[PDB]
Scaffold this active site. Sequence first.
Site, PDB file in Angstrom:
ATOM      1  N   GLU B 415       0.775  -1.251   0.000  1.00 20.57           N
ATOM      2  CA  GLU B 415       0.000   0.000   0.000  1.00 20.57           C
ATOM      3  C   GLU B 415       0.815   1.315   0.000  1.00 20.57           C
ATOM      4  OE1 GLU B 415      -2.968  -0.332   3.056  1.00 20.57           O
ATOM      5  OE2 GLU B 415      -4.118  -1.800   1.880  1.00 20.57           O
ATOM      6  N   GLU B 506      -6.032  -8.596   0.744  1.00 21.10           N
ATOM      7  CA  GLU B 506      -6.829  -8.153   1.865  1.00 21.10           C
ATOM      8  C   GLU B 506      -8.274  -7.916   1.468  1.00 21.10           C
ATOM      9  OE1 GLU B 506      -5.513  -4.759   4.027  1.00 21.10           O
ATOM     10  OE2 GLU B 506      -3.410  -5.461   4.074  1.00 21.10           O
TER      11      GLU B 506
HETATM   12  C1  LIG Z   1      -3.777   2.606  13.282  1.00 22.79           C
HETATM   13  O1  LIG Z   1      -3.331   2.888  11.920  1.00 22.79           O
HETATM   14  C2  LIG Z   1      -4.240   3.674  11.274  1.00 22.79           C
HETATM   15  C3  LIG Z   1      -4.426   4.995  11.692  1.00 22.79           C
HETATM   16  C4  LIG Z   1      -5.353   5.803  11.040  1.00 22.79           C
HETATM   17  C5  LIG Z   1      -6.092   5.293   9.971  1.00 22.79           C
HETATM   18  C6  LIG Z   1      -5.921   3.973   9.537  1.00 22.79           C
HETATM   19  N1  LIG Z   1      -6.662   3.531   8.493  1.00 22.79           N
HETATM   20  C7  LIG Z   1      -6.352   2.509   7.659  1.00 22.79           C
HETATM   21  S1  LIG Z   1      -4.922   1.574   7.900  1.00 22.79           S
HETATM   22  N2  LIG Z   1      -7.115   2.168   6.596  1.00 22.79           N
HETATM   23  C8  LIG Z   1      -6.717   0.958   5.831  1.00 22.79           C
HETATM   24  C9  LIG Z   1      -6.537   1.182   4.328  1.00 22.79           C
HETATM   25  O2  LIG Z   1      -6.156  -0.067   3.745  1.00 22.79           O
HETATM   26  C10 LIG Z   1      -8.425   2.812   6.321  1.00 22.79           C
HETATM   27  C11 LIG Z   1      -8.509   3.869   5.193  1.00 22.79           C
HETATM   28  C12 LIG Z   1      -9.195   3.540   4.006  1.00 22.79           C
HETATM   29  C13 LIG Z   1      -9.327   4.468   2.953  1.00 22.79           C
HETATM   30  C14 LIG Z   1     -10.007   4.160   1.773  1.00 22.79           C
HETATM   31  C15 LIG Z   1     -10.126   5.105   0.751  1.00 22.79           C
HETATM   32  C16 LIG Z   1     -10.858   4.754  -0.545  1.00 22.79           C
HETATM   33  C17 LIG Z   1      -9.558   6.377   0.902  1.00 22.79           C
HETATM   34  C18 LIG Z   1      -9.664   7.452  -0.207  1.00 22.79           C
HETATM   35  C19 LIG Z   1      -8.892   6.690   2.083  1.00 22.79           C
HETATM   36  C20 LIG Z   1      -8.781   5.745   3.101  1.00 22.79           C
HETATM   37  N3  LIG Z   1      -8.096   6.075   4.279  1.00 22.79           N
HETATM   38  C21 LIG Z   1      -7.962   5.144   5.329  1.00 22.79           C
HETATM   39  O3  LIG Z   1      -7.362   5.453   6.375  1.00 22.79           O
HETATM   40  C22 LIG Z   1      -4.986   3.167  10.204  1.00 22.79           C
END
Ligand SMILES: COc1cccc(NC(=S)N(CCO)Cc2cc3cc(C)c(C)cc3[nH]c2=O)c1
Lengths: 603, 603
Positions: B415, B506
């Site tokens: 990612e 995933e």
């Molecule tokens: C604890 O570590 C942390 C701390 C804070 C946030 C996160 N979030 C995480 S890892 N994800 C996993 C992404 O595979 C959610 C997520 C999805 C996403 C989807 C789109 C379509 C867009 C445009 C923006 C996005 N932003 C995101 O954050 C993890």
Amino acid sequence: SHMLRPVETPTREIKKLDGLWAFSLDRENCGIDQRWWESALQESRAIAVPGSFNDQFADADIRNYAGNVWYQREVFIPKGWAGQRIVLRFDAVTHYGKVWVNNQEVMEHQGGYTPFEADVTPYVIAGKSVRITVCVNNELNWQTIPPGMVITDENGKKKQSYFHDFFNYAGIHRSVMLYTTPNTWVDDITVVTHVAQDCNHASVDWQVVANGDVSVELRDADQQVVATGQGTSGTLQVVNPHLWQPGEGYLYELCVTAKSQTECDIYPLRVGIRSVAVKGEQFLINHKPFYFTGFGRHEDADLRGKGFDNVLMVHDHALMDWIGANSYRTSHYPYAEEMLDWADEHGIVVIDETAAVGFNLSLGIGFEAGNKPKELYSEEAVNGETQQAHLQAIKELIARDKNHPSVVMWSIANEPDTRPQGAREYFAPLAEATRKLDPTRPITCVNVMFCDAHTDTISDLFDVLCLNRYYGWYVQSGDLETAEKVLEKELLAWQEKLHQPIIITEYGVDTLAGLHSMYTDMWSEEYQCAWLDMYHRVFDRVSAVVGEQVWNFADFATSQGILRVGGNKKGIFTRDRKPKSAAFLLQKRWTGMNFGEKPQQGG
Amino acid sequence: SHMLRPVETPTREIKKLDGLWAFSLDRENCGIDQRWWESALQESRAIAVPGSFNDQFADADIRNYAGNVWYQREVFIPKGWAGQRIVLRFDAVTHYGKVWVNNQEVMEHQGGYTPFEADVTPYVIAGKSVRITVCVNNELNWQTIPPGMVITDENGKKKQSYFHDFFNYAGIHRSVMLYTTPNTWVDDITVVTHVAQDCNHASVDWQVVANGDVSVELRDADQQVVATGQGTSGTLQVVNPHLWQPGEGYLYELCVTAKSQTECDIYPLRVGIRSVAVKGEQFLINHKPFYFTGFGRHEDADLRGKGFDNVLMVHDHALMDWIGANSYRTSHYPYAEEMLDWADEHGIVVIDETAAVGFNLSLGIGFEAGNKPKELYSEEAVNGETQQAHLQAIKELIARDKNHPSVVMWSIANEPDTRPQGAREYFAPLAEATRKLDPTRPITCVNVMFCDAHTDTISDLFDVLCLNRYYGWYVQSGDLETAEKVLEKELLAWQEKLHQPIIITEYGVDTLAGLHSMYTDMWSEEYQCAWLDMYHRVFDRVSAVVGEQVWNFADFATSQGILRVGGNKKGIFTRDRKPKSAAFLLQKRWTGMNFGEKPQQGG
Ligand SMILES: COc1cccc(NC(=S)N(CCO)Cc2cc3cc(C)c(C)cc3[nH]c2=O)c1
Ligand SMILES: COc1cccc(NC(=S)N(CCO)Cc2cc3cc(C)c(C)cc3[nH]c2=O)c1
């Protein structure tokens, strides 16, 4: 025989705990007849040691299995091991083991919580691989130390039943090891510290020895040689010392030298200058009025069973330290020695206990088929052998732990029924024999609530009063108001009856983490808190009460039943060690007191 | 350098992962000033190794510490190790570690997940006792793999921030060990296995030696010598063979001998004979289209953090076997080599991944405005040095894992934000380097969903398309109908864009165990079931989809925020390994298919 805790100087070890061994069940019990141990187990799979076999595989059929299982693994003997003494040791093998080095039967053991070892030099060759095969039995019967009964069904299979709560985990629960000794070798040691009003004091050595002369030297914390003795059989050194205490736990090191004209054997035996005994209604360590806190514990955790584990060990002690426990009891079996070494090191007080649990048949809770022997002490049920098997169990624990300063007491058994007849005839000899094995520490037998102060025929034979009580829970269920009366009434009734010092070695209520109630009732978190509050209110109104240990430090696994919701839920902590709201109540009481000090019948 | 995994042949280990070590924080950062390696640590508490350090003590302040910590421990060199090459090896020290043997610095390594070893003979005396201090550091920056940013508030108190989910656990997570070789010794081996429509084939072999002639033999399962080889750095062996195969992973064993005139060395390397290649939209193992099922996993469990543990490993593998999983990805960092030996032996297919997660500044949680470099690929943030430290992470991983037949592909990163220009500038040379390092396995870079078929700038550079997708949960929240249309349209766009094989690496939803609902909405067990099921319907419609790895095997600890209810709950199992009802859904789908084989688009 003689047990000495391996440490590493003119001796060194390959721990074989290196975990993955080959493993299999022997559902046909054809294993000994077919001589499985001559070649690689077939139809095996990897298993880890140390840990219980039951839960490693997420399989009910393996978890509830009864009979023999096989462990096998290979291991190169270290080249440097010359013509030396080679010694194979198991810290435990749960219930019974038999051992084959390649084809040589080297060992046999009944008992599941204590070490056994053998000299293997003649069937091993240093620098080469050797097969190790262990046969493990988990069956319990009447002459076994927890007793039990195996019902074989008509259909071919075994099925174990027994009389204690905790689940029947089995397997190699502790470290195995190959270790090395010189042909001159210390093989036994014993040490006694006398104390005198806190100014000065003396310690006795006695030491059996592989052939050789002993120089005995006691060292400082800082390795300054402050005690010296000669003689391979006995001494006493009267130095003016620094004591083993509960807040802090100081320790000396007594090196032990055995000499030949060819060889030398060097042994450091940690030693805590401490005196233990009872005076009236007081418990005395270094002639002081102690007050016990902490829990009954178990060796239990997700995935591993009763298998030993360093992280688990480090974390739980962190938790006990934080919450104000100064002490605990080795609930219903000898624990792995590492716990005791830690207790000494950290000055933690330990009521050490044997696996003698479940002598009782009234306990209990049966909707089911009765039998079940009619007379508890009979040739049918608890018999001559059983007192002898039991005797042997007490030797070993004492053989192992006599030198551990942290152990301030022995526990002979837990919750036997003393209403049937032979109950005083069974218990009197072992009580006598116990003190003939170690007169330095007091001895108890832990008491079930239905052998109450008017009916229990056995308590005078022991030094301290150890009670397990449930007054709002099993009876007066839910009723703090009347539960408090019965309890006090029954504590006072013990105080006059025996005028011994009293410790409650079990007080607690099943509580589901996350269950919350405005009505503060059974199984709720709030209830646990109110019920512990109350038991407490009541020990503050009794002079003879000098010890308190909570039923369970953490939730553990049990036999499947109607009274056990996925196990015993009486932990202050959940099994993954998350604290129930009662951890924080015990927190206040246990750190609020002065150390080792009962309140002013108030606070 | 060269890395071979220690085994016991002429060779010998003393484990020393005996785990009781001394431990302390360094809060004022005095440790290197005051030469702490020189004297036994002060104010030092016992800690278990291997383990993460953060969770063993139930203390938030230790858990969230950023900075330096120290591990200290005395050991005994075996007397037997006389003329011997004595090596001190650490399987991992998380993030950076510096090592002293008694005031002699021997090592330093940056990386939290692969081993480092030093030849220490000249700083140790066989048969004497040594003091070993490790200084371990858990901080991340733009040049560390993974990257992060420590923030120091006005008070000088450091606070780590990072761009990945999982909790930054640190400490000595894996075994440490002293081990032995002769002064002639094999220190590197490389094996390539070839095969042709499967009746018989060869294994090229390349062998680097410390001072010797090398010879080589291929021993069978039942130990018979199926072929022979001579020469040093070059050989090739031909064979009529039982291939290593996803079901069962048959293994020959290659036996490496380095001969001097005087001294001799012997090294067994397990070999699995199998080919791995992409052919169009298919992923071929031994020339057969394969279909992945199973998980992205983490290294995580209660108390021990990422600390390795044998019981845990045997248990999770019984779980994955039971559930029908045929594979996994070492999400997020290299796993314990033990994990790969297991895979090798049981025929589990693995996607091996670097620790390069977090390249993205776009997965923020909301609304703490600041503040992060505005250009991802810039000298401030992800720069030439980073690319070096990344290339290094790739090298170290492949050096370790190249002979593992269970490894069928390398994932370089998870990612990264590929939108900013220079993403491609940064990854092209890494893609290239990786292929050169190992030409024998396909290569990938796991793709984040907002880099989508139309915006992504990198995926043509790799062999297999691995997608992390969350439609229905992060986007179209709760709406399966429209999540499903978007998933399918996107997967088809990728197939038509690149015509590579697609593995979804995933897919999953947060599911609180025990939250049940008739509405089948977002955090309930029923939603987890319906959502995975919708994903499954779409995969079976798309011919380029060649694998499915459900996002979490089990719940795991994350850093704190509003999106993580005490961790990531995308587990199929809870952290204590209890099944959620989706476990039985996956079990039916995966054990019901033909092994290794994509469904027929139908039930
Ligand atoms: C604890 O570590 C942390 C701390 C804070 C946030 C996160 N979030 C995480 S890892 N994800 C996993 C992404 O595979 C959610 C997520 C999805 C996403 C989807 C789109 C379509 C867009 C445009 C923006 C996005 N932003 C995101 O954050 C993890
Ligand atoms: C056979 O293994 C099992 C299985 C399931 C439960 C138990 N229970 C156990 S060990 N305890 C002892 C608590 O320290 C609960 C218990 C208390 C009790 C009290 C009285 C006053 C009477 C008359 C009968 C009782 N029966 C009981 O069972 C044992």
